[PDB]
Amino acid sequence: MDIAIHHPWIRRPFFPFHSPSRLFDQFFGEHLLESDLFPTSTSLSPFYLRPPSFLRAPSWFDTGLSEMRLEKDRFSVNLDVKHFSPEELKVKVLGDVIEVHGKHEERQDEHGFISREFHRKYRIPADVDPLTITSSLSSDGVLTVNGPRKQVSGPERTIPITREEKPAVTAAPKK
Amino acid sequence: MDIAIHHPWIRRPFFPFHSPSRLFDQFFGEHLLESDLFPTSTSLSPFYLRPPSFLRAPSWFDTGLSEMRLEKDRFSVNLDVKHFSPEELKVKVLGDVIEVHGKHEERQDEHGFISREFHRKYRIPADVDPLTITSSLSSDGVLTVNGPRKQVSGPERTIPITREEKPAVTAAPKK
Amino acid sequence: MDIAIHHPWIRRPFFPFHSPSRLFDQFFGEHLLESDLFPTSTSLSPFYLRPPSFLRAPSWFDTGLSEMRLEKDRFSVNLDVKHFSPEELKVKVLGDVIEVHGKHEERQDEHGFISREFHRKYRIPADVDPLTITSSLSSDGVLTVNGPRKQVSGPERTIPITREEKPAVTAAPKK
Amino acid sequence: MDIAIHHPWIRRPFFPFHSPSRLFDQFFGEHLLESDLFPTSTSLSPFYLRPPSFLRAPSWFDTGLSEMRLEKDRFSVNLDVKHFSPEELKVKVLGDVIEVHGKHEERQDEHGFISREFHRKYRIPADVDPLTITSSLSSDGVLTVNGPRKQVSGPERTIPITREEKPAVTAAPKK
Amino acid sequence: MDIAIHHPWIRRPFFPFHSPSRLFDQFFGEHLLESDLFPTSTSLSPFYLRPPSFLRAPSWFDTGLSEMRLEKDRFSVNLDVKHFSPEELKVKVLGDVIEVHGKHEERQDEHGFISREFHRKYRIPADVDPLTITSSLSSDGVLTVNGPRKQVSGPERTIPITREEKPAVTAAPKK
Amino acid sequence: MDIAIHHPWIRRPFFPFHSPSRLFDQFFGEHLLESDLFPTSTSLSPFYLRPPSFLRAPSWFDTGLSEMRLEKDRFSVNLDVKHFSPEELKVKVLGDVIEVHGKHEERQDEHGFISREFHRKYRIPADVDPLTITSSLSSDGVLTVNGPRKQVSGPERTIPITREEKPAVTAAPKK
Amino acid sequence: MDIAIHHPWIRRPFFPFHSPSRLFDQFFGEHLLESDLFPTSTSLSPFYLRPPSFLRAPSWFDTGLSEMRLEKDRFSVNLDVKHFSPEELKVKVLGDVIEVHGKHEERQDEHGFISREFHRKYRIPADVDPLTITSSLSSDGVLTVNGPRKQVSGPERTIPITREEKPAVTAAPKK
Amino acid sequence: MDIAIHHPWIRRPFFPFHSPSRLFDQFFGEHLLESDLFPTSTSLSPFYLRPPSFLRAPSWFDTGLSEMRLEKDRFSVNLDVKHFSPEELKVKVLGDVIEVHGKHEERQDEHGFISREFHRKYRIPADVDPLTITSSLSSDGVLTVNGPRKQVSGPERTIPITREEKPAVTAAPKK
Amino acid sequence: MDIAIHHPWIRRPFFPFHSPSRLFDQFFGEHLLESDLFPTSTSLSPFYLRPPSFLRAPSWFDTGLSEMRLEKDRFSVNLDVKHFSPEELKVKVLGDVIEVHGKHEERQDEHGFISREFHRKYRIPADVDPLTITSSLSSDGVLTVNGPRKQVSGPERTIPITREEKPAVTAAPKK
Amino acid sequence: MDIAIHHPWIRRPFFPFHSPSRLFDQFFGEHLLESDLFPTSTSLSPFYLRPPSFLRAPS
Amino acid sequence: MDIAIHHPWIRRPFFPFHSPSRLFDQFFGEHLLESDLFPTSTSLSPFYLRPPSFLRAPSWFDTGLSEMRLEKDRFSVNLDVKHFSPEELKVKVLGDVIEVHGKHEERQDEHGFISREFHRKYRIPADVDPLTITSSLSSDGVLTVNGPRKQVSGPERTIPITREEKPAVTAAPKK
Amino acid sequence: MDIAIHHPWIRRPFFPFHSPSRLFDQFFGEHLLESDLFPTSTSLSPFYLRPPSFLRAPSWFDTGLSEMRLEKDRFSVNLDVKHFSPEELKVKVLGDVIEVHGKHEERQDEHGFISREFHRKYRIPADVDPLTITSSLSSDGVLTVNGPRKQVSGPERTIPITREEKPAVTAAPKK
């Protein structure tokens, strides 16, 4: 990371984008925090944020959409368990996440027994609904979770706590 | 002060008071300087500095009041000189400050003479006016600075001189 | 450069100018860049930069008139070649810059020949025009460039390049 | 820290106490360890440590008393559970510590259920005796622990184990 | 040396010995120096020093004994000279130290002569006495120092000179 | 660790052993890795490693043997439980490791009960076989694990995994 | 470049690719230098370097081929000059590199004339041969270099000089 | 010793001498140590060492010869003593080294006597042989050591001791 | 102060002055100290110092003159006191220094009185003589100091004391 | 070519007499030239010429 | 450099030369500059410099002579061009320096032509005079420059400009 | 030695002693070396060094005298040996230094014999002359060295060898 090369070079194809306020992360952060309080006469927004764009005719907004749903219908998803494991399989419908845990010993040796296991992790919210979504097992291991759908999920960890106006602290000189 | 403890800790209860503009001392300082020039349609105030408060209903303003006057009426006031010192006492009325300096030798030893002294320092502007405040002495030392009242005082040292439009300076490289 | 003297002293005859926006070079720089795009209802100005002045009655603007032309009329300029050098002189009219290069050997020694040279550099835009401005030589060396005038010039090197909307660069941690 | 101020100042109102043996923590520590072995001819002492005092007439001894017992009598303390939680409450009598854990959902919303909880922590040794102290619950949640008393407790963590006559270790130069 | 391991560990099996006076080398050193002057009321002592022991019933004293003599009687020690060297051997009785130096060339080669040598160093004070102890040589080299015995010796170098009451010397500040 | 003494001294008695290939740990390590793949026409070895020996006549090989078995026959090992604890003892045969855990309270005080415990840890592979080795308890606590034997064991942690042929990584200059 | 992360992580995926001789660049470099002298009994080699591969069945050799020729046939390449520039174009056949330099002013303004230029850089050795390859221009600017082909080229700068087997130097200690 | 000049310049004429094995002092040192043990099938060698040479036809070997003898026959060497000193001269034949020490006072002053001395140091092995080589003196000081010859000598100090195969040392971590 | 620029540059236009004796301040200082003792055969000198000059024909000397007197006559200087202050003015004739101190309150406000003051400092030796020079005041404040003159003054502080024949000190090694 | 070693090490011994100018061998040289070409102590020694000049006072 | 050896050792064979004035380069440099101005009654001198010699009888002077001319007469020097190259040769008489540049291709290969070139560099001033010295070529390449001689030359670069009486520079404290 | 006190204070009493030539040790050293060669027209001196004195009337010179002789006559010095030691005494007349070494055992103990010894060291050149001075012993130990005298001596080590004439040494840059 030659500071005498990478610094002036990584700033070369940046000019036409520069002048975006030395405090861009806070400037726009405030405007996005204002529209996140009350529907500010906009076409509403789950979290649409007005970003700096070169587009002159249209107004672009940062959104998701392609991160929740996509291509689905009535459906009847099927889990994968190549080899049957009726008693050695456990299907779990934890919310909008369908998983299958089947382990069967099909390979055998002298004094060593091999055990294969198939584990599927389906995070399909627009395909699963804990209530109606059920499960049907076959004799070959072919698991099939049938049922309607329509919904979005996704476990994240973005919950800033504390900071709530009023309280404060203080200090004093020392060393 | 453990920088790895006091810093993140002293910055905890501060949450509800955070986001007070990184330049709070200058930002509000300018607004207070603007209202200190001409009575800006305010309820008239010597130095009502509008500070950041959590009060939603009422508007708070920084003021004095409880640092000038309090409980006074007509009065006569009385200095303290337990032991008489008619010729050895000097009462001074320096403005809104009444003081008494009386020293009398009441205790005596072999070759050592003891001398007691009573010195009172009164900073009562609300009940002292050098122009009309007199002094009366008793035969026991009881001093009484009778007279009218009503006034405010207090010697401070806040007079930032210099800087007054159109100066100009300069400099040059060095090594 | 006693930092404990020159710093607090140089910051003395500057108070009356102080508080001129810690970012004065960028603040006004933006306002000057805005008026440099389209004639903003001003009295029209190639580069009239509204600067901070103490003048309360009139509005001052940074000019440049006294750096183009001044005292000219409709005559002929005369180059200097005290000693004749008809064949040894070359007059060049490079734009608004009239120059003369004449070298003649008038002083002679034993085995050493002295050669004097007269070189004039005239940057008179309001007096020269490569088209009409001609040149007439005398028998004594007196060169005289005759012709009309009226024009402004001056070779400078202030042409910032690049920085054209739509770039973008990036980087990453290092060690 | 102002080592050139706090050091000589924090040692100012300390003179009249100075000369307390540079090794005060060990000197007196030995005398207190001697009286902690065998009941030395004194008015006994649970841990009364003869400290350096200015009292000339009486002899002061560091003691507790006001850290075990205070104001108690034939009682029947009662825990606090404003809202009834018969099946949702658990009273625990862990030694001289009476605690109550009751949680009941009294506030309800659309799809969110609120649950309040009352938890009391009583460390009353002179009021509790796990052997006899019982508990009686009311229909409103008013828990009442009835029974005799008289006792002292308090969980601490001061138990030095190592060191026990006849050890010996060794070492040698290194680099 | 692992100051963060060997230090706290080398101080582990040492606690039961700890508190042996930070100045143990000087404290006891003084008491041993006092009993080294005049035969203090004791069972006498060549250099018996009362050391800190865990023995409660008996009183231990640091002594020698097993460093002077041991198992001896009317003797006639014999030196070792496997091969005869009557003219090439020199026996020396330097105090309580009997030594033998015999060198004989028994091995021969082409142009190289080998010479074997036997050197014994006997520091037997309880077996030797310069006066009486004589020497007798055999024809095979068997040397035999005959004579009585009883005596103690041992060349050491512990003679701390200097410091002898009333000296006087000083210095002064410098830089 | 005087590097100016220990270094040249610890390299003195190494003199006649020096020159053992500066990369002895890798040189021989390779030859031992080659014989650890396929029985290389040797007298069959479990892990015999040809080490640098001074023996000229015989060829020495690093071996174990005295770290697996020693002196056994048919046996019927006996555990130790001085005091009976039929209900308070638990014998465990975890592989080739026989252990006994018996705790009985034989000593009693006023309000304090003493409990002694006997725990044996036997790692005898050539004496134990979990499949056949049983356990018999006596009325005095004398435990006796009877049964055949012959076997080798020993829990170690030497399993350097991964190095799955065909990997490779990459990097680049930084700062 | 976290040396405590990248280093161990840039050597992990390297895992089974290691053991390639700490001096791989010199070891193989010598074997490649030996086969570069005399055509060693092989299927010849322009510069085929036997590299370390995991291929067990076949023997891989570092080669070029796809860096000289590819898809060519009896041709007549055509240069690009969208707008005609008969007198303002210069075709140059510098070896196996065909280039065209044509500049024509098609766009005109008030006092500013625009001039477009088309410059092609062809490095086709298997398509060009200075001798036969000629050029034909059209009236629209369409240049066409016709002629046979078959050849390989490529200007590189890999020519180490000196190391004239048979020299010498020395030098001496200094400071 | 400009490291940025002498280093790359001193290795410059070393150009064609490079690649002499980074461990040339040890590599060849082993081969020379192997031929120094048993007379390996060669034209023998007093200490000839096969060195790296550019000679292609002949094989060069590091030898001495011109460091032992050179031009001698029967001879009768003569020492130098310009002025006679029969009684004041001492001739010494220490092996293959003939020396003469003669001092005579020929110059005299007032109270100071001058004494000249002639000392010759002859290290002629091929000319001297302690046994037969005698000495003859003349009346003028001309010394003459007559006798046969033929021999080689030269006192050096190259005798590496110790490394008596079969030692070993050890150490341990410290700090 | 670029030492790599200002140093060689500040020494550039100094060459034609260089070689002025590295100890010019002491060399000439001695010659000037010699002519300051006894009136050496010259045109005398109050303090004329022969400096290094380029003047070849005339001899230049460092003089004063223009720092004592200039253009004066009989005269009768006048002080300045725009507004009359008969009782509020004090004229002081301290040697060759005439000063006037007059303060009069001409401007008045509500409760604030303004007082103007005129203070002149005349250091005219060739115009003042304490003895004769008197003062005359007018009714408008016009002060006039009349009287003769002729003399020079000027209070400076250049009096090096000590270094009074034969002193001597001493020292010694320390650390 | 130790520019960061010899350079500051050679200008060090010059300091005892370094401060005036960068050129010390031409002013004192010409100053002695105009003083040596003049009969000082001894007497006589001339020879010159005279070309056209613009100077009126000198020549 | 062994400052502790080379410094005291180098200063050994220099004592008998010592005391040559710590400023020898400037002391003598001044005396040589004085004799370089006007013929100082010496036996003339091109640049003879009186150096410090040990010769007591004669006076030595640093001179050249053996660096201008040596052994010449009145002949014709001849350049060297082994193989004829009339059309491909260029003789240049640049002052007192005669040079020849002839290149002829005599060796030929398959597709490679070898070209030999002979270049002589003669700096003979006492043998060359551009005015008269001519050149004559032979049919074999034998070039012969004929003509008189007698002259001295030698291109050097010793022209220290600047410094010329009457300069002066200045500076000031900085930081 | 506080450099901020001792330095300016140790140079204070040096005030009028200064100006003794910064190179006083060399300046006068040369003048003293000149008068040490040939007897320069003076009152003759052995080593009289004209030093800087404040004496105006007389001329002082550094001299010895009081360091060679003082008060002597015919004389017959006598050594001291309180107790007779005829056979146990040795008188040595080493030049102008008379010494006596007598040791006699006069004090006796049990097994310890005390021995007294008297050793005189006389460095009297003006009283001793090895040639004539003899020695006469008495029966009580009174030694008496009788004889004439008149002479000067004194062993010193001031012989600076080396620093001859014409040596020559050199060096070169390094790093």
Swiss-Prot record, chains A, B, C, D, E, F, G, H, I, K, L:
Site location (Susceptible to oxidation): Y48, W60, M68
Q: What is the effect of changing D109G?
A: Found in patients with restrictive cardiomyopathy; likely pathogenic; reduces CRYAB and DES localization at the Z-bands and the intercalated disk in the myocardium; cytoplasmic aggregations of CRYAB and DES
Ranges for region Disordered: 146-175
Residue(s) carrying Phosphoserine: S19, S45, S59
Its domain of life reads Eukaryota
Family annotation (CDD domains): ACD_alphaB-crystallin_HspB5
Q: Which residues bind Zn(2+) 2?
A: H104, E106
N-acetylmethionine sites (modified residues): M1
UniProt GO molecular function:
amyloid-beta binding; identical protein binding; metal ion binding; microtubule binding; protein homodimerization activity; protein-containing complex binding; structural constituent of eye lens; structural molecule activity
- Keywords for this protein: Acetylation, Cardiomyopathy, Cataract, Chaperone, Cytoplasm, Disease variant, Eye lens protein, Glycoprotein, Lysosome, Metal-binding, Myofibrillar myopathy, Nucleus, Oxidation, Phosphoprotein, Secreted, Zinc
- Residue positions annotated to bind Zn(2+) 1 are H83, H111, H119
> Listed GO cellular component terms?
actin filament bundle; axon; cardiac myofibril; cell surface; cytoplasm; cytosol; dendritic spine; extracellular exosome
The compartments listed are: Cytoplasm; Nucleus; Secreted; Lysosome
**Modified residue annotations for N6-acetyllysine:** K92, K166
Instruction: Give one GO biological process term.
Output: negative regulation of protein-containing complex assembly
Which positions does UniProt annotate with glycan attachment? S41, T170
- Tell me the subunit arrangement: Heteromer composed of three CRYAA and one CRYAB subunits. Aggregates with homologous proteins, including the small heat shock protein HSPB1, to form large heteromeric complexes. Inter-subunit bridging via zinc ions enhances stability, which is crucial as there is no protein turn over in the lens. Interacts with HSPBAP1 and TTN/titin. Interacts with TMEM109; in the cellular response to DNA damage. Interacts with DES; binds rapidly during early stages of DES filament assembly and a reduced binding seen in the later stages.
Record family assignment: Belongs to the small heat shock protein (HSP20) family.
Function, as annotated, reads:
May contribute to the transparency and refractive index of the lens. Has chaperone-like activity, preventing aggregation of various proteins under a wide range of stress conditions. In lens epithelial cells, stabilizes the ATP6V1A protein, preventing its degradation by the proteasome.
Identification of the protein by name: Alpha-crystallin B chain
Q: Which organism is it from?
A: Homo sapiens
